């Protein structure tokens, strides 16, 4: 049923994933079919290398990669049976640990184009940061916002191992022309960065 959702490790690290019938483990890389890695809790499937193992620490099933290799960053799924039913776990993505990087923040006012059809989308971009965890907050003339913004986040960059994140404030055109100052705030840890613009400048 359940597994630790997200994991950062380095090449060389020892890595252990947990799962809530004996379990089978599958590996999936983006855009490819899953492969079977471990069946019957602890049996290595054909061609799977030896740094992989499985175990039952108490009542939970584990998969261990004793020494993580570049080709091992992927998603991992455990799979059980119950009656005539089969179920896969939520999945666990194993990501590349890397040095902390501050996002460069860009704020974009709605285009004149979008405005003159009566909608206002303000777009905040956090670019090339690590780790993934951040808190975004929209400000409109200094009043914080709620219920009117959405967020989305890229997978890890294949070059630098960073993430990017977009946040979109959707306002009516009218609610937009009523106000002057627009700011999104990015908190990561002890640092909190605000970027803004004055409408019409």
């Amino acid at each position: 049923t359940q597994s630790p959702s997200s994991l950062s490790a380095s090449v060389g690290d020892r890595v252990t994933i947990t799962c809530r019938s004996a379990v089978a483990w599958y590996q999936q890389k983006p855009g490819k079919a899953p492969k079977l890695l471990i069946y019957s809790a602890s049996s290595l499937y054909s061609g799977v290398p030896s740094r992989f193992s499985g175990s039952r620490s108490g009542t939970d099933f584990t998969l261990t990669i004793s020494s993580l290799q570049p080709e091992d960053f992927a998603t991992y799924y455990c799979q059980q049976s119950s009656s005539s039913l089969i179920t896969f776990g939520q999945g666990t993505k194993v990501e590349i640990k890397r040095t902390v990087a501050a996002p460069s923040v860009f704020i974009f006012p709605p285009s004149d184009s979008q405005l003159k059809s009566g909608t206002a989308s303000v777009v905040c971009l956090l670019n090339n940061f690590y780790p993934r965890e951040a808190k975004v907050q929209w400000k409109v003339d200094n009043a914080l916002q709620s219920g009117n913004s959405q967020e989305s986040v890229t997978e890890q960059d294949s070059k630098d191992s960073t993430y990017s994140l977009s946040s979109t404030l959707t306002l009516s055109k009218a609610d937009y022309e009523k106000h002057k100052v627009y700011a999104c705030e990015v908190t990561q840890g002890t640092t909190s960065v605000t970027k803004s613009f004055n409408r019409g400048e």
């Binding site: 004996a22 379990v23 079919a33 069946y39 089969i86 460069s104 989308s121």
Partner: protein, 225 residues
């Protein structure tokens, strides 16, 4: 020397019907079960159904029990999934995988053979309504160091839309966000790129939005405001 090959599927209206194929080569067919496993875009795997030799040996998950039907023909070593009553949550990539003939019977605290061989997958998407996207510029924030510019791809349905920059010529520094579903029931995303501020007056930046569900291509020139 064992293969599963998948086929059929793609675009259908909800309240339509579609039939997936899994033709298998390189092994004694009747000694195994064939399973269907689907994965919604950017989501986990979901076991759907299986069948063995004897056609009484079938089962389905609670999400598809009455809407789908699994069959098999041992004459040619193929197996089918007929899908009916096609709601939204049916849009997914659909794999077929091979397991043991008596997997249910063998299932125990120490045993689980899992599914060894898998097909390449086939995309199945149900387009209830269709809207093409509007595209608006995210105009360069500065004029120097680095500048960020982008395209807001807005109010389309259903997924997905692809985004290139300069028709594939610019790829470095590009970030295309996964779409979000707005409260309006329409999808939206942004694509951005970072470039050197000094190229703003000498280089052109166009974003290319493609939306197959509506056969729309939008090309948008992002200029400094």
């Amino acid at each position: 020397e064992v293969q599963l090959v998948e086929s059929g599927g793609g675009l259908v209206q909800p309240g339509g019907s579609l039939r997936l194929s899994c033709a298998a080569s390189g092994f004694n067919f009747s000694y195994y079960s064939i399973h269907w496993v689907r994965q919604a875009p950017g989501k986990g795997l979901e076991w759907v159904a299986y069948i063995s030799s004897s056609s009484s040996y079938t089962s389905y998950a609670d999400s598809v029990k009455g809407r789908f039907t699994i069959s098999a023909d041992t004459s040619k070593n193929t197996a089918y999934l007929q899908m009916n009553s096609l709601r939204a949550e049916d849009t997914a990539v659909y794999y077929c995988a091979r397991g043991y003939q008596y997997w249910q019977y063998h299932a125990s605290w120490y045993w689980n053979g899992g599914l060894d061989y898998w097909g390449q997958g086939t995309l199945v998407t149900v387009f209830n309504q269709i809207k093409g996207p509007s595209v608006f510029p995210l105009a360069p924030s500065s004029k120097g160091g680095t500048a960020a510019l982008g395209c807001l791809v807005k109010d389309y349905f259903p997924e997905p839309v692809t985004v290139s920059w300069n028709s594939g010529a610019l790829t470095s520094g590009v970030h295309t966000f996964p779409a979000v579903l707005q409260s309006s029931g329409l999808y939206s995303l942004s694509s951005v790129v970072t470039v050197p501020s000094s190229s703003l007056g000498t280089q052109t930046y166009i974003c290319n939005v493609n939306h197959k569900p509506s056969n729309t291509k939008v090309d948008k020139k992002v200029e400094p405001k």
